[PDB]
Amino acid sequence: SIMIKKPQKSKPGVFSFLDPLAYEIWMCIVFAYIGVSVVLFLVSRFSPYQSSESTNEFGIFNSLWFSLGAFMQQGCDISPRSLSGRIVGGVWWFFTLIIISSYTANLAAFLTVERMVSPIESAEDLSKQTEIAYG
Amino acid sequence: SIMIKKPQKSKPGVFSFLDPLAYEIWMCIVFAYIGVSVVLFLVSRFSPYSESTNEFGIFNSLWFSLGAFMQQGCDISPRSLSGRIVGGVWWFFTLIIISSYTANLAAFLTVERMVSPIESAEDLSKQTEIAYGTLDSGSTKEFFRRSKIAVFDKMWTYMRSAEPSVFVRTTAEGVARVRKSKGKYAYLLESTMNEYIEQRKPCDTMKVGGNLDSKGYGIATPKGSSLGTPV
Amino acid sequence: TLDSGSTKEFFRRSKIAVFDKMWTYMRSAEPSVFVRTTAEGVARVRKSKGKYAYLLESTMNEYIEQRKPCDTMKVGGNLDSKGYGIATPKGSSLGTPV
Amino acid sequence: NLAVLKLSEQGVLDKLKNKWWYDKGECGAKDSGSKEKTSALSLSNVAGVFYILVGGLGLAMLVALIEFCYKSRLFDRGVQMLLTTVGA
Amino acid sequence: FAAFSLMTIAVGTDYWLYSRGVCKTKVMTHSGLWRTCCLEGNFKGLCKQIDHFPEDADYEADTAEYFLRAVRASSIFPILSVILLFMGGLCIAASEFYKTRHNIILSAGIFFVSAGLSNIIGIIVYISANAG
Numbered sequence: 284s285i286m287i288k289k290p291q292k293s294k295p296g297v298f299s300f301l302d303p304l305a306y307e308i309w310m311c312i313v314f315a316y317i318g319v320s321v322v323l324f325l326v327s328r329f330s331p332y333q334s335s336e337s338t339n340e341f342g343i344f345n346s347l348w349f350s351l352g353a354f355m356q357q358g359c360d361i362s363p364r365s366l367s368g369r370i371v372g373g374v375w376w377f378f379t380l381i382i383i384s385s386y387t388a389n390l391a392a393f394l395t396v397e398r399m400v401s402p403i404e405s406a407e408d409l410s411k412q413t414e415i416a417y418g
Numbered sequence: 419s420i421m422i423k424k425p426q427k428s429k430p431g432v433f434s435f436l437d438p439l440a441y442e443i444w445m446c447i448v449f450a451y452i453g454v455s456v457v458l459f460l461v462s463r464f465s466p467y468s469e470s471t472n473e474f475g476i477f478n479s480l481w482f483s484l485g486a487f488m489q490q491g492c493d494i495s496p497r498s499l500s501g502r503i504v505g506g507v508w509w510f511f512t513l514i515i516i517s518s519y520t521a522n523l524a525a526f527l528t529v530e531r532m533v534s535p536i537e538s539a540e541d542l543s544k545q546t547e548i549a550y551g552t553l554d555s556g557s558t559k560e561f562f563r564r565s566k567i568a569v570f571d572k573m574w575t576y577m578r579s580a581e582p583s584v585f586v587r588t589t590a591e592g593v594a595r596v597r598k599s600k601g602k603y604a605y606l607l608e609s610t611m612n613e614y615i616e617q618r619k620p621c622d623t624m625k626v627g628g629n630l631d632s633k634g635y636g637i638a639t640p641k642g643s644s645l646g647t648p649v
Numbered sequence: 650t651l652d653s654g655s656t657k658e659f660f661r662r663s664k665i666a667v668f669d670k671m672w673t674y675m676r677s678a679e680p681s682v683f684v685r686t687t688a689e690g691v692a693r694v695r696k697s698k699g700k701y702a703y704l705l706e707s708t709m710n711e712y713i714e715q716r717k718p719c720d721t722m723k724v725g726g727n728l729d730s731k732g733y734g735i736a737t738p739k740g741s742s743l744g745t746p747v
Numbered sequence: 748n749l750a751v752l753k754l755s756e757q758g759v760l761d762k763l764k765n766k767w768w769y770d771k772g773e774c775g776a777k778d779s780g781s782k783e784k785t786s787a788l789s790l791s792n793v794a795g796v797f798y799i800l801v802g803g804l805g806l807a808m809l810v811a812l813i814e815f816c817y818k819s820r821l822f823d824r825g826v827q828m829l830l831t832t833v834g835a
Numbered sequence: 836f837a838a839f840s841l842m843t844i845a846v847g848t849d850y851w852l853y854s855r856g857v858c859k860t861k862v863m864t865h866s867g868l869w870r871t872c873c874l875e876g877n878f879k880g881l882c883k884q885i886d887h888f889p890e891d892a893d894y895e896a897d898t899a900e901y902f903l904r905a906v907r908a909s910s911i912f913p914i915l916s917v918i919l920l921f922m923g924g925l926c927i928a929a930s931e932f933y934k935t936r937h938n939i940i941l942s943a944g945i946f947f948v949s950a951g952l953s954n955i956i957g958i959i960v961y962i963s964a965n966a967g
């Protein structure tokens with residue numbers, strides 16, 4: 284068997300808050316966040332028929348504001364105000380209910396972890412590197 | 419039974435709801451509140467070009483940030499680009515802290531009970547830290563000498579190999595020794611003595627574990643006299 | 650266990666009290682808890698639906714775990730330290746070169 | 748040869764190994780590995796959140812500074828068709 | 836002026852915290868920025884200048900424990916509050932001269948804002964590397 288020293292308890296780093304959800308889920312979040320806002324932009328501003336276009340207040344940037352607003356639990360001032368953008372928005376509300384309730388289930392367990400580092404185990408870097416001696 | 423010093427438990431004070439965040443975090447969340455609201459003021463009233471068009475100010479902003487922090491909504495929203503791009507940061511900032519707050523308050527409201535040390539005397543055979551003794555010229559001290567159960571044998575081995583004397587001469591001697599040993603010397607006695615010492619002031623002692631056997635007190639007579647059967 | 654087996658002899662000669670009560674239950678059995686070959690007990694546990702456990706050696710155990718249909722499982726730890734060896738008749742000349 | 752097998756048969760080796768390795772569990776993790784502490788959150792846990800919070804402020808202020816810079820002093824409906832055809 | 840005075844008094848200081856440590860090797864501690872000065876012992880008031888040198892498992896480029904120490908035992912964020920604070924104090928002092936351009940004192944307050952933003956970072960990193 285190989286004896287080495289004790290290591291020191293590595294505390295979690297800076298960007299650990301996004302730790303309980305794996306990166307792929309975060310990727311799909313950003314993609315769905317773009318898609319929902321763009322689809323909601325498309326449903327409005329679609330020649331609504333002297334107000335024939337400015338019936339709503341949803342531009343692309345207002346929608347980009349609304350989706351981010353509805354995700355983090357504080358709704359904005361405006362509302363979809365017509366049909367068929369709202370069966371986007373209700374599905375997005377269902378999405379933001381099911382996601383962050385799964386986010387905040389055991390968050391405090393992920394900010395005090397302190398797992399170890401373990402440089403070598405099956406030695407073979409004692410062949411490879413030149414740094415750590417052994418006898 | 420086994421008597422030890424009762425560890426002094428802590429009571430929840432009056433402000434026992436500010437517990438799952440420390441006072442450093444409580445002052446930094448106060449600082450950053452002021453900072454975010456005054457930055458949102460600065461970026462709003464900045465001569466855009468007419469001037470009274472936007473609705474924000476120092477006062478509106480001071481309770482906008484509060485109404486965004488505690489989830490109670492608002493009355494208005496930042497409409498300028500940098501106002502929106504500063505508001506989203508505060509929206510992200512609250513979602514990490516207040517979630518941590520509730521999810522940890524659910525951890526403080528489950529348990530308050532201590533982890534209960536050297537119970538059931540097996541770690542009294544295992545560890546070498548806390549000592550323990552009996553009464554000299556005593557039936558318990560004789561019982562561990564004559565006992566053949568292996569854990570009791572190792573306990574007798576530790577008691578006979580002692581530096582200094584783990585044994586005492588009278589009961590109150592060992593009582594005072596455990597009251598001053600600060601959890602470094604256990605004590606062995608009988609359960610009636612144990613519960614009587616528990617039911618007195620200063621109540622700093624404690625019975626741990628269960629029992630070990632079934633002894634019994636009796637009336638003793640000389641062998642063969644006539645008092646035996648009437649007693 | 651297996652009949653004509655070292656484990657079945659081990660529980661007969663064992664003196665630890667839990668093993669003694671296990672031997673008592675094994676000798677007081679209705680029907681026979683003992684089997685004749687290894688695959689017999691394998692099939693018996695595969696069909697007993699958690700009503701008949703089985704005792705064998707850990708190498709047999711991990712080999713049966715690493716096959717299809719993987720419906721078996723090793724539980725607990727070990728119990729002792731046996732060992733396989735090469736066996737020779739007593740006194741012949743093959744002993745020290747083997 | 749006949750003696751060591753008796754001690755292997757009767758578990759005396761197990762008893763001695765337990766006595767001289769496992770009854771003297773002294774240091775740390777063997778004893779305290781199965782206990783529980785609840786929590787108390789310190790600032791060292793939550794620091795990058797404040798870092799992000801402060802950096803966002805400077806970014807937002809920098810945005811309005813160059814906004815006031817530009818408005819102190821797409822394009823060509825038309826070439827938007829060029830932009831979308833090269834983008835497609 | 837009050838903020839500049841209080842920040843300079845706060846930077847040039849031996850007394851921020853109080854804990855239990857040593858004075859000078861090879862105790863209730865009157866500890867501050869780098870002069871971890873001490874009292875209540877064999878001698879009272881010998882101010883050892885401290886920096887970082889642990890005896891670790893040789894963290895090579897462990898950045899959140901290294902670059903953090905680098906910003907810690909060289910106060911650059913707390914010192915910059917003084918710089919911006921006097922830089923804006925000059926601009927509010929230069930308000931009277933070169934006036935009637937109605938633009939200059941806007942530049943002043945930005946320094947006062949950003950100095951606080953530097954201060955709040957300095958406090959966080961100091962509390963961070965006290966427990967670091």
Ligand SMILES: N[C@@H](CCC(=O)O)C(=O)O
Pocket residue numbers: 553555556557558559560607608
């Ligand atoms: N009844 C016991 C008390 C002391 C002991 O338990 O050893 C006796 O007289 O011996």
Ligand SMILES: N[C@@H](CCC(=O)O)C(=O)O
Pocket residue numbers: 651653654655656657658705706
């Ligand atoms: N190696 C053992 C296998 C059977 C058993 O463990 O009882 C033997 O030949 O006896």
